[PDB]
């Protein structure tokens, strides 16, 4: 359906222990394709998807160039945020920045975004219209002004509506076998006897792509959300995902319960039943 490109930047100070940690990751949909890590050897932007490896020197030299410009801008930011907030040079603090663009099934621009965060909390963010900002508090107000006076949002809106999406569209072809795929969940159920008056019923979705999925239990057709244990959707490690939902059933009523799976890759919603 739709598709997205997103870059994630984690910048963490290490006072009396040197330069800041700076990590950059890049994703198209749920697939990472690149990484930068201040602490690694190459100081290059490295590929983490096999489709991107044959991009060329021009691409790699540029991404490295830019990823290092980010690194530096983030090295300054950490100090500037120490000041805004009147904080000690002793403290280790964290900055986070996420930006990316989305195309619809038309592979036509749909939306862009840019969020910045100091210490796990919203700082400033590009609003949906990509022409104005939302400073979260008093400190971010200074940035909001600074950035409006720099016409920062003009420059972002342009990247997001151009470079961003055109390259998102590029990658979707360069890795069409990976990215335009739809690995439907491999599903099955299990039954353990938590006691002799009870038994755990667990619904498994394995090896699916993308991550978006929905697992739900029912008793007599009626949802058990209140009484269901959902784990977070988790990485299998091979570019697919996993997830399970478990209910406890008083022995005898296994018949009453059903599990339900909704995914992109299923033509019809699966209705599992312990029957």
């Amino acid at each position: 359906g739709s598709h997205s490109m997103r870059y994630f930047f984690t910048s963490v100070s290490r006072p009396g222990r040197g330069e800041p940690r700076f990590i950059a990751v890049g994703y198209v949909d749920d697939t990472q394709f690149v990484r930068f890590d201040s602490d690694a050897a190459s100081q290059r932007m490295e590929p983490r998807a096999p489709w991107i490896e044959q991009e060329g020197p021009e691409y790699w030299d540029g991404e490295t160039r830019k990823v290092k410009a980010h690194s530096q801008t983030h090295r300054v930011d950490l100090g500037t945020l120490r000041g805004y907030y009147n904080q000690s040079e002793a403290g280790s603090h964290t900055v986070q920045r996420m930006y990316g663009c989305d195309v619809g099934s038309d592979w036509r621009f749909l939306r862009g975004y840019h969020q910045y965060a100091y210490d796990g909390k919203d700082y400033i963010a590009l609003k949906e219209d990509l022409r104005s900002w939302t400073a979260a508090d008093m400190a971010a107000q200074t940035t909001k002004h600074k950035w409006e006076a720099a016409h920062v949002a003009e420059q972002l809106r342009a990247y997001l509506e151009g470079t961003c999406v055109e390259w998102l569209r590029r990658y979707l072809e360069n890795g069409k076998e990976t990215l335009q795929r739809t690995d439907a969940p491999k599903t099955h159920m299990t039954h353990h006897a938590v006691s002799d008056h009870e038994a755990t019923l667990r619904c498994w979705a394995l090896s699916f792509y993308p991550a978006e999925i929905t697992l739900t239990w029912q008793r007599d057709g009626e949802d058990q959300t209140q009484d269901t244990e959902l784990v977070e959707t988790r990485p299998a490690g091979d570019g697919t995902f996993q997830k399970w939902a478990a209910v406890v059933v008083p022995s005898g009523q296994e018949q009453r319960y059903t599990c339900h799976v909704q995914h992109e890759g299923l033509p019809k919603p699966l209705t599992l039943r312990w029957e």
Binding site: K66, H70, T73, T80, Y84, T143, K146, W147, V152, R170
Partner: peptide, 8 residues
């Protein structure tokens, strides 16, 4: 493809 990059 990366994006300046303005500081806070």
């Amino acid at each position: 493809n990366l994006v300046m990059v303005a500081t806070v």
